[PDB]
Design a protein around this ligand. Sequence first.
Ligand code: REA
Ligand code: REA
Lengths: 229, 226, 229, 228
Amino acid sequence: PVERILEAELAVEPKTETYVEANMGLNPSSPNDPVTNICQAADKQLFTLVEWAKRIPHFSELPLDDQVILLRAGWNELLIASFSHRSIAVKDGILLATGLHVHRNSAHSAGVGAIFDRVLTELVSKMRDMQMDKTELGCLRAIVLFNPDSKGLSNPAEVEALREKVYASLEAYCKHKYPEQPGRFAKLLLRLPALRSIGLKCLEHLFFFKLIGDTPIDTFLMEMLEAPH
Amino acid sequence: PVERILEAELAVEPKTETYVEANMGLNPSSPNDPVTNICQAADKQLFTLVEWAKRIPHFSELPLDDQVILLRAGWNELLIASFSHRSIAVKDGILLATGLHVHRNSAHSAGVGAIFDRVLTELVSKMRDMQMDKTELGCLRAIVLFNPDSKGLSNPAEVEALREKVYASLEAYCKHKYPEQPGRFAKLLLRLPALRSIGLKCLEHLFFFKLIGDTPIDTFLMEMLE
Amino acid sequence: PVERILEAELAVEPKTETYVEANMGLNPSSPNDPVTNICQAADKQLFTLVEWAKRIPHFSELPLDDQVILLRAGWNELLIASFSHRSIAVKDGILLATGLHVHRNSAHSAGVGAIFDRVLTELVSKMRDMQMDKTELGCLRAIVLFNPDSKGLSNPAEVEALREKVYASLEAYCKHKYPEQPGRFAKLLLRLPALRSIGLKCLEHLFFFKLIGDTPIDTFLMEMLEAPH
Amino acid sequence: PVERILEAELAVEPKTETYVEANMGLNPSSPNDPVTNICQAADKQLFTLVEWAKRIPHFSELPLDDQVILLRAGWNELLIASFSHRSIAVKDGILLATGLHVHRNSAHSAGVGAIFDRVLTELVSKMRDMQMDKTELGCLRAIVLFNPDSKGLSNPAEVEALREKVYASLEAYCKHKYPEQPGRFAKLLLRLPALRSIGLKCLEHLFFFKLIGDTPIDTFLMEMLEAP
Ligand SMILES: CC1=C(/C=C/C(C)=C/C=C/C(C)=C/C(=O)O)C(C)(C)CCC1
Ligand SMILES: CC1=C(/C=C/C(C)=C/C=C/C(C)=C/C(=O)O)C(C)(C)CCC1
């Protein structure tokens, strides 16, 4: 069921109450301790990522250790793929939670303007222009999850076979929804290299962290220093 | 025409008169200076990459400054794709163009065995098991050359168009040559993510430089220190 | 001087009971939730570093903005120096503040084996070979803390003067305590280059996150994966 | 003996002509070719480095394998240390062997400005303010050369022993040459961590390669496919 993929994708997508609420500030968590925020949002993100994977057919039938291995190897790219696709809605930017979100400047003043340019140019814009739908996105993420190159896999050949079945379905799906675009399938697959190197840069540069800034760092450190000697 | 790409592949390949010349040696030059000998080796492989690119249909039709951009953006992966495939003939190392064979334990030379094993497992090992031919290898490198994401391109849309004509022909080729492998075309394309990340790791470990420079440098060092 | 710095090393770090809790039960909180758990663990460790810094003579008399700068510049080296010295007792892996022994094989399984081995050979064994004592360790860390090369300092010269006071006192201590080892003082300082490069490699490898986050994450993963759909 | 080392640094102490030929252009090599230019050097630098090391007492006495491993473990820091001291005579710039001056502007333009500025503020400026002399520089370099943490050497102990002889000598030097400044020995030694991190960053960020500029890349690259 190429739907059980799209379904898993749609069953994890952020609502419109976290887009709204956070946009104006109608959410709780009172922005006062931004040491919690990143942590809480991180745990929620991780939780939802695991739920999404368990819904991917055959994933849970994989060995325990291998499931952990695949998640540790793809979580980064799986997250980048999602927010890039959600960013199709914003004008020249990335979407996280609060009223549209981070623009180039914020990224620029954060020192990561160059990788921000890469995300918009290689992912967001490309997804928007060929109008990647949520079913194709779900399939690409599943292909990412079923990464046969992951180190430690008890049986990489099994992971590769599940990957084959996933993209075999994506090809049929494309062949049915866009007969006019015979090269759509390949085009989809040809976004994975960009996802790979962008994923590596965001990792090595801690993209998202630097976006937040270093003032909260100085703030919490200051709080420790004003701790009662 | 996937055959015009297949031809560009063979032409730029050694004539076994160079292969012998190293995996069997034959340097009618005798190594002497190190850093200079290394650059000459680099200049050599670099020029052969440019020769190859010129023989790729339409490449030379793109604006000159864009050709340079695509070259500076893909040289790294293009060379890795070349020796990873050529290394299918051997059992446990990477076979360089200059015929030189660099084993694993000997290559790792307590310095780059990590990415070295990645080349064997993610690229070399996979290419051998599926037995991709020079035509498929050629099309994959052509796809890599025609990278529409290359920063600074004046017309990404035209590079993308050229890229599409290539994998469309690659797909037709695969479905005609290997009738009973419907997922072969996709499997070929799915090695690009690996090539992309290995490409990056080879840059931060000067994999190349060391691969073609530690011997000339160690030789130099031994005479100097004698 | 030497005595106040030694007192700083001894104060925050031990109680035969602390090294207890995390290495045979007799511990609370039970690992369950991911990110927030590790963030609290990190917060605690960093605080111990701040309390220590505040006990080093003159550090507190510097502008608050400079204390923050020095802490941001040296925290990673200050911590590695601490656990590296604590590990001279064993010949396998490293001992954490909680006295728990992280074995060599755990570092290699986590993909940080090469850097872990550097800590072992360049710091742990070297400290063991010369039997570096706690006074000398504290002085080296104080020197690392007063790093005049830190960017943004309002007055690097004052930080440099605080550094020289520390190493002038360290040298007197060594020559008085170990008169038969004339090159001891230099040998102590010559471990700083190693601490520097190891410090940088630990950052690029996310050494610290893996040290406190790898286990709680896999536990969370393995539990949710086999749990009821 | 380090004036045999200071004589080792003087046996190559960038003469005079070499500086006027480059700090003007009265040098052959017709600055027409690039690859050839940057290459004649680094080969010349490597040669001068190896000859410098052979003159360091006891080095040539180590097993051959240990010698090459020490040289390849330290060449980067050895080179950075040398042009840093030589640049004391210049402001916000660096001087290479031939009198080739590289200003920080070129570094910030190529994307390696922060590392270039670390060389200026952590090495050059420090060396200048304390007036580090060539003998002290030669000893710091000998210490870096005898790096006992170097991987794969047959006897780390023997290397650290040679390292101790060097710094014991450096301390003696400082005490008698500068009796009025007791912290000088330590100060010299405390420039080593900075040299360590700078060397690593220079390698990580392809320092030298980026200083060449991108134009000479597009140059002969445009040449290769613009043949005649
Ligand atoms: C542009 C370039 C370099 C290129 C090296 C190459 C291209 C090496 C080896 C290729 C092999 C071994 C290819 C194959 O056999 O297919 C080096 C690092 C010297 C540094 C200067 C920039
Ligand atoms: C600053 C910082 C972190 C710090 C971790 C520390 C400082 C942990 C533990 C050290 C140990 C294990 C020391 C010892 O036992 O000696 C982590 C990675 C969470 C991520 C956020 C940034």
